[PDB]
Each structure stands twice: as structure tokens, then as C-alpha cells.
Design a protein around this motif. Structure first.
Motif, short mmCIF file in Angstrom:
data_model
loop_
_atom_site.label_atom_id
_atom_site.label_comp_id
_atom_site.label_asym_id
_atom_site.label_seq_id
_atom_site.Cartn_x
_atom_site.Cartn_y
_atom_site.Cartn_z
N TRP A 45 -32.41 -38.97 -33.94
CA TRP A 45 -31.24 -40.21 -33.93
C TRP A 45 -30.33 -39.34 -32.56
CZ3 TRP A 45 -26.02 -40.10 -33.23
CH2 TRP A 45 -25.92 -41.51 -34.15
N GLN A 73 -30.79 -32.60 -40.70
CA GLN A 73 -30.99 -33.99 -39.35
C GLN A 73 -29.44 -32.67 -38.48
OE1 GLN A 73 -27.70 -37.51 -38.45
NE2 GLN A 73 -29.74 -37.98 -40.06
N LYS A 87 -25.35 -34.92 -30.95
CA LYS A 87 -25.00 -35.18 -32.17
C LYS A 87 -26.07 -35.72 -32.98
CE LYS A 87 -20.73 -38.22 -33.44
NZ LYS A 87 -20.38 -39.28 -34.16
N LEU A 110 -22.77 -33.65 -44.79
CA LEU A 110 -23.03 -33.47 -42.80
C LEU A 110 -22.43 -31.49 -42.39
CD1 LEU A 110 -22.90 -36.37 -41.21
CD2 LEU A 110 -23.45 -34.44 -39.44
N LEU A 144 -19.67 -44.52 -40.92
CA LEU A 144 -19.95 -43.20 -40.51
C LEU A 144 -20.19 -43.00 -39.02
CD1 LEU A 144 -21.98 -41.49 -43.34
CD2 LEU A 144 -20.03 -40.61 -42.91
N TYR A 156 -33.38 -41.27 -48.57
CA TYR A 156 -34.84 -40.86 -48.35
C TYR A 156 -35.64 -41.05 -49.74
CZ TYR A 156 -33.17 -42.17 -43.78
OH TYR A 156 -32.37 -41.89 -42.10
#
Ligand SMILES: CN(C)C(=O)[C@H]1CCC=C[C@H]1NC(=O)OCc1ccc(C(=O)NCCOP(=O)(O)O)cc1
Length: 319
Positions: free
Chosen positions: A252, A203, A233, A156, A40, A129
Motif C-alpha cells: 500500500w 505494515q 507511507k 501504527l 485513518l 486480517y
């Protein structure tokens, strides 16, 4: 915002999509390999293209030797485990899997799939998670669409990610939905052991949400609790509390772990990493040592934090 740059020591490498760092009750350390995660990251959109089944590895922390414990697949569909917690009553790992839902995995490598469907009877979504509360209820994020055999998708870009609570009576209750890629998750406890707040990372939206916990699968007062900096990103992935209930969050793509105080808001401090993509993190029990997984080098590192970690459920006493 203050920033610290502590020393990071590399423990192992060559683990695709390295995630789910976890310690069991015997102090053994496990990590998850995730070909789908790595894919991904390398893709330019719909590409995820059949990937291999990720597995769970035992990692010797003196020698770095990796031992495959389990490569879960059910009915030809390779699992994509992403997050791990150790149970308290018995030594077994609860593993959120984006293709298979919630697993319970034994150290000898056998595993059980926990739920084809939820308690209202709707199909299960792929899980990422999870966090135990001190009551033994497991809160879980689910950014994927339906479990296998549905085609794989992840929220996403669109709002369809869900939150579950798997209760101590074995009910899988959907507690919320329409998240855009819910990721790390944690339970803030009061000093007296009472569960108080559920923190969930969304996220790509650079937000942390909170709910007040009033009981097993009983949440309210949904609010934005924390702001995650940067326009990169990515965004918040894994997260863990320290003994003082500061929340450390892998950001991240930012090269930082963010540190939030107990009341949230803006980070109070950042931890600069020697890599851009911290993904997940977990404390070594009764230590200040944080193990961090990372997607630049598909590696696991450690660094020393200023204080010990918060006890996981597995470290609490049946008494
Ligand atoms: C990778 N990661 C840190 C994760 O936590 C995984 C595991 C399950 C939950 C969330 C996942 N997050 C994730 O994969 O984030 C990285 C990412 C991947 C794809 C994308 C994306 O939207 N498109 C890929 C192409 O984007 P551009 O190259 O055009 O910017 C954005 C971020």
C-alpha cells in the motif's frame, strides 16, 4: 527486480475503505466497506471522530450492483470489518473486525460475535486480517487495542498489535504480541497439506515475519522472512498465495504488488498497478484471476495472474 504491468479492469467504485474481497462456496463475491479505514487515511493523527458502521456488500461481478448483506454493530458500536475468509463446513464468512473482534456472518446477514475475551481471559483486541489453515484453525492479526467499548486505537506508531489463533475447539488463543500494526497474514502449506509457516506483515516497518507452525496455536522460530521495498507511507497490507506458493503482497502506497518466492527474502518480481494504494487481494477460485481492492478510487479491480491461486480452506473437501 523484474516488473510486469498487466491489464487491470475496474469492477466497481465508491466503496469507502474497500477491503475484504472474498468468494463463498457458491462463487458469490463479497467486499467490505470501511469508513474508518478511509478516515485513518485522510487524518493527520489522533483525529479518528465518530465514523459510520462499515458493512459487507455482495457485488455482482457481471453488473457491479452492490447489495448490503450486513452492517454489523454491537451495543451502539459500529463494526469495522477489514478481512474475510469463507468457512469450509457450511457457507458462512469469518470476518476480522477492528471494533468487534472476530465475527461469523451468514449470507442472510445475521452474525455472531465470537469472543469477548481470549483463552487466558484477557480482553480481546480489534482484528484486521485472517487466514484459515487446512485444519480449520483461523490465524488472525490484531493491530487495534481492545474491542468496543474501549476507545479505538491502532498500533501504527507503537508496539501493541497481537496475533491470535482461533482453534477448531473454539479457543481464541493469543499467540504473539507487540507488533507495530500487523496486517496481512497467510499460511504456507506443504504439498501434502501440512501447515508449515505463518507469514505476517508488519505494515509500517516494511517487514514480513515468519513462524514455523507445529500445531494449532503452536508457533516458534519467529524470524524476519521478507523485505518490503520503499519508504512511502504504508507497506504490506493484504496477501495471498498462488498455486506454486509464491506470496503476492499488496504494498500500500508503493503502486505495486510484490511477489515473493517460497523462501522469502527480497521480492522476485513486482506487479505495477494503475494506482498507488492496493489494499487487499483475493483469487477467484480455480482461476488465475485476482481481485484487488484499492484506496485511490475506493474501487475493486481484477487482473490475470500467471497461474491459479492456492486453494482456500473453503475449497477443500470434508472427506
Ligand atoms: C489502510 N490500510 C491499507 C490498512 O490495511 C488499514 C486496515 C487495518 C490495518 C492497517 C491499516 N493501515 C493503514 O491505515 O495504513 C495507512 C496509514 C494511515 C495512517 C498513517 C499514519 O501513521 N499517520 C497519518 C498521517 O501521516 P502523514 O500524513 O503525516 O504521513 C500511516 C499509514
Amino acid at each position: 527486480i523484474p516488473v510486469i504491468e498487466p491489464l487491470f479492469t475496474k469492477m466497481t467504485e465508491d466503496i469507502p475503505g474497500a477491503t475484504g474481497p472474498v468468494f463463498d462456496k457458491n462463487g458469490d463475491f463479497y467486499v467490505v466497506a470501511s469508513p474508518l479505514s478511509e478516515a485513518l487515511i485522510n487524518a493527520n493523527s489522533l483525529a479518528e471522530a465518530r465514523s459510520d458502521a462499515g458493512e459487507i456488500l455482495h457485488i455482482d461481478l457481471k453488473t457491479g450492483k452492490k447489495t448490503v448483506i450486513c452492517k454489523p454493530e454491537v451495543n451502539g458500536y459500529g463494526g469495522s470489518p477489514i478481512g474475510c475468509q469463507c468457512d469450509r463446513d457450511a457457507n458462512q464468512l469469518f470476518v476480522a473486525d477492528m471494533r468487534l473482534g472476530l465475527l461469523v456472518v451468514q449470507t442472510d446477514g445475521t452474525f455472531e460475535e465470537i469472543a469477548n475475551k481470549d483463552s487466558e481471559g484477557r480482553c480481546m483486541q480489534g482484528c484486521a486480517y485472517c487466514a484459515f489453515d487446512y485444519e480449520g484453525n483461523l490465524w488472525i492479526t490484531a493491530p487495534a487495542g481492545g474491542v468496543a467499548p474501549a476507545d479505538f486505537t491502532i498500533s501504527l506508531r507503537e508496539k501493541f498489535g497481537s496475533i491470535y489463533c482461533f482453534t477448531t475447539d473454539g479457543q481464541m488463543i493469543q499467540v504473539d504480541t507487540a507488533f507495530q500494526c500487523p496486517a496481512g497474514i497467510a499460511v504456507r502449506h506443504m504439498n501434502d497439506g501440512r501447515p508449515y509457516q505463518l507469514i505476517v506483515a508488519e505494515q509500517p516497518t516494511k517487514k514480513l515475519w515468519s513462524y514455523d507452525i507445529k500445531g494449532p496455536a503452536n508457533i516458534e522460530n519467529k524470524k524476519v522472512w521478507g523485505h518490503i521495498p520503499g519508504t512511502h507511507k504504508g507497506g504490506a497490507a493484504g496477501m495471498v498465495f498462488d498455486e506454486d506458493n509464491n506470496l503476492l503482497v499488496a504494498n500500500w502506497g508503493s503502486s505495486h504488488i510484490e511477489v515473493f518466492g517460497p523462501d522469502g527474502g527480497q521480492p522476485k518480481m513486482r506487479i505495477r498497478c494503475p494506482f498507488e494504494k492496493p489494499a487487499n487481494l483475493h483469487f477467484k477460485p480455480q482461476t488465475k484471476t485476482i481481485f484487488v481492492t484499492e484506496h485511490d478510487n475506493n474501487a475493486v479491480w481484477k487482473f490475470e495472474w500467471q497461474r491459479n491461486g492456492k486453494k482456500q480452506y473453503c475449497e477443500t473437501s470434508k472427506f
